[PDB]
Amino acid sequence: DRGVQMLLTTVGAFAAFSLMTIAVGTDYWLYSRGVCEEVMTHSGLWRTCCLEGNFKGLCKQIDTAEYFLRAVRASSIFPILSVILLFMGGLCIAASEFYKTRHNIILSAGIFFVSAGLSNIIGIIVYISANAGDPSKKKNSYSYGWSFYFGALSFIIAEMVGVLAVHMFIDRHKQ
Amino acid sequence: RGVQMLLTTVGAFAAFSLMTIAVGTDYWLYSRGVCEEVMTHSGLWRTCCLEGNFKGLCKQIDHTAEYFLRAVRASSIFPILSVILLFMGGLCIAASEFYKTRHNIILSAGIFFVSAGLSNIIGIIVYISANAGDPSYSYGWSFYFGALSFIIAEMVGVLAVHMFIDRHKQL
Amino acid sequence: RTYIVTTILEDPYVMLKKNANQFEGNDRYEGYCVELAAEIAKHVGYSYRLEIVSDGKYGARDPDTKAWNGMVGELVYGRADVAVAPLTITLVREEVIDFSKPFMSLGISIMIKKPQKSKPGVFSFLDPLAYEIWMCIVFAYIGVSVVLFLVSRFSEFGIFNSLWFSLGAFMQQGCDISPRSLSGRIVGGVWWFFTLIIISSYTANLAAFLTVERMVSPIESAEDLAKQTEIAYGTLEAGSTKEFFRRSKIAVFEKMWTYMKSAEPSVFVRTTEEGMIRVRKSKGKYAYLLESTMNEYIEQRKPCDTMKVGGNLDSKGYGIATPKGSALRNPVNLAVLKLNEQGLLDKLKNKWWYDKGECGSGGGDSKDKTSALSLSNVAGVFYILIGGLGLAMLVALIEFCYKSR
Amino acid sequence: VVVTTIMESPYVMYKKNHEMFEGNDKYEGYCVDLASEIAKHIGIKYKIAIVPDGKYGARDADTKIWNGMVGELVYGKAEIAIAPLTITLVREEVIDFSKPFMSLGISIMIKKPQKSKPGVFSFLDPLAYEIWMCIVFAYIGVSVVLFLVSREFGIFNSLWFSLGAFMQQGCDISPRSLSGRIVGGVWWFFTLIIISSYTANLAAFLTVERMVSPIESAEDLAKQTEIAYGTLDSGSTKEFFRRSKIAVYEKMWTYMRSAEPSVFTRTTAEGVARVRKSKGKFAFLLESTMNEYTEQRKPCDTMKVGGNLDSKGYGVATPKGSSLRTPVNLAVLKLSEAGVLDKLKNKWWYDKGECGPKDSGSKDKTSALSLSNVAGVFYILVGGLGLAMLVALIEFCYK
Amino acid sequence: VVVTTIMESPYVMYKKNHEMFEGNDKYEGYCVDLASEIAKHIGIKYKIAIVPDGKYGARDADTKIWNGMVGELVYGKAEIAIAPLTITLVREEVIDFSKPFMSLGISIMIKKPQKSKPGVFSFLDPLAYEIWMCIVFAYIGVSVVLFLVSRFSPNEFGIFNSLWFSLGAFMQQGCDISPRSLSGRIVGGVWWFFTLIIISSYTANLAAFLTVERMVSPIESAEDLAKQTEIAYGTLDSGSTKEFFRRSKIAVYEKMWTYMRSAEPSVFTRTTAEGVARVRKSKGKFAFLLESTMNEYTEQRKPCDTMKVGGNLDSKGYGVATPKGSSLRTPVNLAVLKLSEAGVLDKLKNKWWYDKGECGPKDSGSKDKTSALSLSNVAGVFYILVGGLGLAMLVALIEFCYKS
Amino acid sequence: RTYIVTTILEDPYVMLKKNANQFEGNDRYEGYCVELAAEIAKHVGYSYRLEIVSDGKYGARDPDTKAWNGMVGELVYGRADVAVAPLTITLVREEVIDFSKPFMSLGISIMIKKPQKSKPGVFSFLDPLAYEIWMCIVFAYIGVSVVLFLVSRFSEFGIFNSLWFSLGAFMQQGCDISPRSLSGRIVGGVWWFFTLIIISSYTANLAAFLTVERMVSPIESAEDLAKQTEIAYGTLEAGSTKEFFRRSKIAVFEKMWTYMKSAEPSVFVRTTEEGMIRVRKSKGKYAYLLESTMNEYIEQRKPCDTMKVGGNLDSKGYGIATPKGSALRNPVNLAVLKLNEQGLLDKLKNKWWYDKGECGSGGGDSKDKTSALSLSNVAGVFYILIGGLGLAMLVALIEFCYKS
Ligand SMILES: O=c1[nH]c2cc(C(F)(F)F)c(N3CCOCC3)cc2n(CP(=O)(O)O)c1=O
Ligand SMILES: O=c1[nH]c2cc(C(F)(F)F)c(N3CCOCC3)cc2n(CP(=O)(O)O)c1=O
Ligand SMILES: O=c1[nH]c2cc(C(F)(F)F)c(N3CCOCC3)cc2n(CP(=O)(O)O)c1=O
């Protein structure tokens, strides 16, 4: 019963790819109430815009142990490295599904899935540090948007693939 | 294994001597108290102030769960029963060293002695709880003999359970 | 001859019957004042028929064109001999006529809303750590679980053993799955450090939150009100209370008088009813500073959200008005003193102020004051736990599937 | 004008400099300064005299005479009585009373509220009882569930596993069922969270040490409690309690009539001495002015007023047919309205006091934890140890 | 009788807006009420005229003319003036001044901090700093002693096994297998005792840290302010404070002046309104220097974000100025002295300075702000989490490369 | 001609050199007042000879039954023109003579002793508990250890195994060997319950002690001292302080005055040096109000255990006596105001009040309050760690001796 397992890994990777694409495309991260005054502002990691207010229609780009994290938040280097490593993991699992003889390919696949978990944790923690790190932020707050839940679901399917593919590693190692 | 039985005998006799010094005399009460702060002492059946305004006298003192603990702490009947149970424990240890072929009743004597020890523990801690309950008491070098009574009870118990470990090889 | 008495209704004296005006007239009067009038008429002997107040007010000094109005104004200007309706003691009232005796005392008292709060259930579990931290630690727990599986199977000891070790590590319990390589051991050690500092921080914050929540005390007396901050309070304008506050010279009284003298908010209001309604609307921080009698009346009303706190600031009294030189001044004084001594006034106060109150009949309704985590706040954990246990029971049946289906 | 006054401790006292001056400037307090203020208000030369009889003023009802201040004013000895005198039904047909310038009534008083030191209750002084009933119920439930779902776990091994889970420890053996893992994890989580909550609650209780008011805080709570109650032998309180129709005081009267006769005391000094020697004993019902005087004296231990009951008035007494009756009436009304008797009351009964700790709370050192909070643990420890060694002896001897 | 008073000073206030309570007493404040009090004390007609110069007083010695209230007095159109006017060398020799009714001070002010949100220092804030190094040293030492006991004394435990045993010993969890010896029991027990005492102390310390808050001031004195050299400072572009700083004699003041000499981001503020706006906008730096009376006036202003640290750099006072000697100089001098000795002047000062302020009513701090553990106190915790888990993964990878 | 300057014998201003003997003549006195007199004589131009008043008292011009004496008394009698000495400005000494200018500001203020608490070592470790409780828990631990060993021998294991299991049970540890049988299981459970309850109680007690230690209210200004009602305060029977307290007008100062007049702490002072001695001997249980000048002199000259706190309660000045009808009235005023504005007087004040003072408060930095632990109570944790390493080396050496 390994064909259903590899199909589950493939569909989980495809779901992760779809979630990454709609994350880098849409701006539904946080249902923040800011200005465009507490109004619904699509605060984005890569694109922050508005729907209401007098300035609706035009929006622009956002931007000894704190400067590095501030530069990380400004440049979004870890989400970018994350999506690149998901692309590399998709390429390597495509090589695995087309070439079965090689063995280190799924070692690389498991390492890529785990590092995807690492980079997702780093990205979400720097995002919540950027959001909840200011004492100024504002009568209402919190109430995270949909794309936070999509990122959480991407994380859950990340442990799903990182459990099932590693189980496939264990069974192919013991056989 | 003569060293083991001579150790038990000397420990029992030392415990006899020090517990008689502990409970027999009138020496265990130091605190900042008024008997005008002068030297005061409690006792088993009477309280006495050695000097001050009470020279030459040694006065017979008086006095569900709360009533029981107050009676035990004040009348000191349970400490009397505990030291008398220590007396029977010492007597049955003397019978044990007189009856050396007693496999189980020697162990039973050990259990009775440690039961008397834990009874003395509960008695002294309810006594000091009542002492701390007066406002809403320190070692008197004979209450220190009571502490040494606990220590020598634990020591004779640990060497006894060491020689029942030796009895495991013997039996 | 029939004697008419001037009666003015505010609460609850000359309130009309619920059957409109189908009765014979003066006999359709129920209240403290009319019962006292009937008793005082039966004591010595005269007529207790009521009269209609001409102006509807109590009367003032009126320096313009002199004269008088109200119940005392009708009494002084003929056609009145007995006044039953209560009225406060004031110098301009005394300089014209004389009172008999204050039948029952009163005083200006502070008024606050009844503190009502309800402890939550599953939401009470997220008080001292919010909800983002719990999500972060749960997702980090599953991440370190899969990482522990990777390092145990890469550097028995399956996914089940990895979950065993991680679940034991999350509560500092430990497990027997000890890998030979030091890597999994150091991963477990740093995760132990993280979960222990989370537990310590949670305990610290819950202790701090409990201490700061329970440390606060309800307002009482007048000095605590004087040094109180961030809570609004004051009195009305059209009344003798403002005159008494202005005429006071006591250091504490003049102190908070100067405090609300620079009334930046809307301290002064017009009527008691509108002020009471807007206190109901706000219900978070205001005080009206009314008389003790009307406060005791309104804390027995239908909403049952007001209560009497503190004591009386002064020693004001009531009194029944009688004209000077009349034959019904001394006998009414003797009889009202007799009824005050007999306790019948206390009986009437109890029946018309505590017995006829449809709401709050039992004053001692909540007086346990349990200053500990009872089964209202921490038992919500007992909810989620049993829910989790229910979840356990639910997964039990699916594990029963894993047992038999 | 000549006035007579009765030597009453919370109204008139002898000055410390008794030999400095004798006469008008020889007393300080409420009564004499109020007399001086009203005398300056009307304008008259005044002198202070003491009562020759010492009676408060009452009718003997057999010889038709009065003894005390009312007896002196009726029989022509004084034309004014600035001394305090309550208003009664019998003292109106022979004497005239002004408007009451003070309000007083029968009020409760208890002993000093102090922190109790229980033995067993201090083991679970925070939290409640139902919390530990439910934690034991959950312990038995999780033990039974873990025993049944695992089928080495017998009727003792699962109990040991749950018991070890109850005190932050793991176990030597682990099952191979994920249901057991899930139930053990959720039980571990519950145990940890409830231990943290209990420790924090104990920390808050130990860091506040706030004393709560006793049960004796209202008349309804007074009738529903088992504590004793007392009053004065014969007086205004006894006369008020002799006849009642309020249906709340008849129960109190029957409680007096059915309890021990020790509830009656002669003097208020004997009463405060009797209530001072015990934290409980009999709370008393006495005058508000007596309570306010006793709460601001050198023994600053009991200062509890509680709720206010009954109504009584204190007024100045004037004889019949006096030209200053209206004058003294308007004078006392002006002093009550503008406010100088209340100012002097605040300056003398509140500002002048032996201790000012009642005005604002103070922080005291909590000192050592002592042993009362721990003594309850040792009892269950030694009891469980004794039960364990008895059952060990029985099990090893029989089985 | 003519009296002058500058309206552009925190000593007057308008009654309503205009055409309300019209007449003579149109301005209410400290100085006008003091003038009315002394006029009732000695007998002086009341006036309302204001000099159109605007400045309180200056010495234009280049043009040989005096501008302001002092010039209006010396050339002559009035004889009594009540206004905030400093006393200097050139002003005394032309106009005699009475005794100073109020002492003047010069002090520095800083913006009130909001919160601190550091990185790993958030978790480093409790249990001090050197305790971490000492407890790591203790962990290394107990690991070395445990390894010595297990190996030299009479096993199946290397250096890695010993350090893991010590790490699990540090964390009140237990061990997989006991050494089963009479030697290691005591050292394991004392190490467990030390680590549980440390953990309980940390929990109690964080509880005490979180139950109440203090907001300790970053600075406390002018000498420490000059010594720290991390916060920008600017006095004023020109005026009495700038002249005093440019011609001081105390040793630290020359260093302070040289610090103003090497000032990059234009610390010389043109107006005091711009200065207070700048110090209220940014709280990280740019603390201001200003007179004590203006600082205390801004202390009770609607933004409510300012706090002085105390200490008076210079001491002077505000005096009453009169033209030359006459029959009124001694009278007004004794009137000012009598009002200064009595508390009536202090009564007016306290009343007009505290009844017009609302910011200071909430004294000390507000205890009704708890919320929960937001990420500000958790940023250190999750940063040490991400660092520990990343380093653990890295050492796992390198240990696999070493062994497997 | 030769002019005279009369100086009162006052401790903080003029000093008669204790050496006496030589240097007698012109330089008979060294101090602030004689230096100011030398400077003013060098500035305006004259020759000054030092003089001492006969009665040794300041004196006044009260309207009594003549018998006038003092500094102003000898000034008005004729044999005095310039008096360079401290002199409080008062109305009773203004109706006959006028002062020039206050060179420095006087203010009455509270003074407090230094709060110093030295946390002990191993004694501070048992501070967050009773020593009876520590004795109880340790002795109960050894008792249950031997009881568990005997019941395990009754119903594989040795003395070392018994000690290991007992202490790991004592301090929440796992073990490789299992507590077999239900009796041993329930002993382990009940004793784990005891160790959990006692560790929770100890953590709660330590949290309570640290919370009550940090949450403390230091005394600042006068309102906090008024509403703390725990530290005694008072002033002299007569003087400027008594006159200011008699004429209080503010409600809080009226409360302070009536608290002082309640005579609960009384005055308890005759000479202010005796008040300084008794407030040093009160161990912080008493407080006293005196002038800021002499308070600074006490804080400098005396050993550093007392200082000032809070701001000045009132504004007051100084002055020098001048004759009513002499030509030495205006130039001395102009020159003393020039010296006050220039800062040379400030330089002399700094030299005489900061340099020649045997105190490290102004000559060195203070201690920063970083909260948390400061090697004071955790120092006791490090001394019980020293005891732990002593036990570790003891058990290791005794084990190696036993095998040897
Ligand atoms: O003689 C007087 N007797 C009064 C009796 C009452 C009350 F009994 F409570 F009804 C009141 N209420 C005060 C609260 O709001 C409702 C009216 C006002 C009275 N006033 C006017 P004041 O100037 O407001 O005291 C008098 O003059
Ligand atoms: O009406 C009455 N009012 C009273 C008021 C007071 C007081 F408290 F001082 F105000 C007192 N004091 C009680 C304490 O001892 C001294 C007298 C006695 C009163 N009595 C006498 P009884 O008959 O013994 O009650 C009355 O009759
Ligand atoms: O005599 C003088 N008296 C002054 C009094 C005041 C104050 F009382 F504070 F209002 C001030 N303020 C300084 C702060 O900004 C607002 C104006 C300036 C004064 N100046 C000008 P400087 O020379 O720049 O000090 C004088 O000359």
Residue numbers in the entry:
A (entry chain F): 5 to 40, 55 to 81, 93 to 166, 170 to 207
B (entry chain H): 6 to 40, 55 to 82, 93 to 165, 174 to 208
C (entry chain A): 389 to 543, 566 to 815
D (entry chain D): 397 to 547, 572 to 819
E (entry chain B): 397 to 550, 571 to 820
F (entry chain C): 389 to 543, 566 to 814
Text from the published report:
AMPA-type ionotropic glutamate receptors (AMPARs) are integral to fast excitatory synaptic transmission and have vital roles in synaptic plasticity, motor coordination, learning and memory.
Of note, the olfactomedin domains of NOE1 or NOE3 align exceptionally well with this density, enabling us to conclude that class 2 represents a noelin–AMPAR complex. Consequently, the receptors in class 2 are A1A4A1A4 receptors, in which A4 occupies the B and D positions and A1 is located at the A and C positions. Notably, NOE1 stabilizes the amino-terminal domain layer without affecting gating properties of the receptor.
